[PDB]
Design a protein around this ligand. Sequence first.
Ligand SMILES: Nc1ccn([C@H]2C[C@H](O)[C@@H](COP(=O)(O)OP(=O)(O)OP(=O)(O)O)O2)c(=O)n1
Ligand SMILES: [Ca+2]
Ligand SMILES: [Ca+2]
Length: 423
Amino acid sequence: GPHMATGQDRVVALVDMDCFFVQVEQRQNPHLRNKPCAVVQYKSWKGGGIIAVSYEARAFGVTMSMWADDAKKLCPDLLLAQVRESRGKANLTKYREASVEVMEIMSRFAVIERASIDEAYVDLTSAVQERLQKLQGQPISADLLPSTYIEGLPQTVQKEGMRKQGLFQWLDSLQIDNLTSPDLQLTVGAVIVEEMRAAIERETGFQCSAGISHNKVLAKLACGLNKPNRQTLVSHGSVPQLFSQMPIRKIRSLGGKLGASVIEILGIEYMGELTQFTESQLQSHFGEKNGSWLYAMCRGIEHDPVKPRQLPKTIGCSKNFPGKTALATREQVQWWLLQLAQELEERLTKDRNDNDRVATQLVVSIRVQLSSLRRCCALTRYDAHKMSHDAFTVIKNCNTSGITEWSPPLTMLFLCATKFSAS
DNA sequence: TGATGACGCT
DNA sequence: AGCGTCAT
Ligand SMILES: Nc1ccn([C@H]2C[C@H](O)[C@@H](COP(=O)(O)OP(=O)(O)OP(=O)(O)O)O2)c(=O)n1
Ligand SMILES: [Ca+2]
Ligand SMILES: [Ca+2]
């Protein structure tokens, strides 16, 4: 009826860097540019663990979480860049700093929510209203949308041909007369995101993709539809067809046990199928919150706000100790707690200088031969010896060894600074 | 054979 | 508070 909310109130984008760590390394080392290449951590174990892959290497079947020695079997000419190691562990500072470059650029356009090291949500509703005012109600030219795909359109034989036919159908259909058409608002949003992505590339060298829609889940889904170096507009109207063959697990938060249970309990495969169930039925199976969430989401509606948050809320350091490397002496545990604590102290001091805040809680987490114990103590001083001494103090009792020895051995250590306050 | 980070439940 | 889920 005239009172059925359609979840078209906002314009939300999700901007995600293409093969991010790989681009960081390629910018640094021009010999890696436009080549099959990957970023690896820890060279000794099977050439190291692949944690990022260029699109060129992806064409050979190289993936994340593959051992480099194995990746080389698929791609003999694969080039590799190694993650920095400091104090005996992988150190991700280069990637965090590149991340800050990008986030700082996006923050000029609109308030952002840092969703991860290489992606951010953007609420463009106000920016769109304003840009709609700045225009004299002039039509939107395709030239303003050079890398934009309109999902579901068109309805030639080469990719760019298709892209342009879809875009032309979209723009030809557009009611630029009313400033309150959600489709018009999304289109202006897409123009702004073209501008943002251009500024990111110009000012960092980094390419990215984006999704533009009415909420975060649709924006995120849209982003991945046409990668790399392209952006995708998913309109409200596109949702029934898009979801009609969209596996449940592709939607953010449904990739795990809950999505599996949706599939198993309801006996469905695709997002669209969820529409067959009453809100009450879905709530009965998956709980009040999840139920309402699913009922709205399968109709393309979601209300989770883009949160005004550009900085991580926690600062952490962890190290696994697999197999025979598991820690078995107290001196070992103490030494590694110290390495972790020294990295953490460096990052915390930098953080306090840049961001005018101080962490107040230290979380210590271990695994014994995914977390054997998690204990918190006060963080009152940015001092590595104190933090590691305190960590030790709070995991001390875990040692079942009556004997200078640690039993069972520890296969993971984790230090996390949390509960920031202004300073 | 990894290193992170946000948020939900009780 | 501690533990779990989901994700990059
Ligand atoms: N399990 C993972 C996933 C990602 N990353 C790091 C390396 C990635 O380069 C960066 C961003 O991850 P994405 O999942 O966005 O993947 P990419 O940016 O590498 O590729 P795409 O272009 O597919 O987004 O985070 C990681 O360390 N461990
Ligand atoms: Ca990415
Ligand atoms: Ca990402």
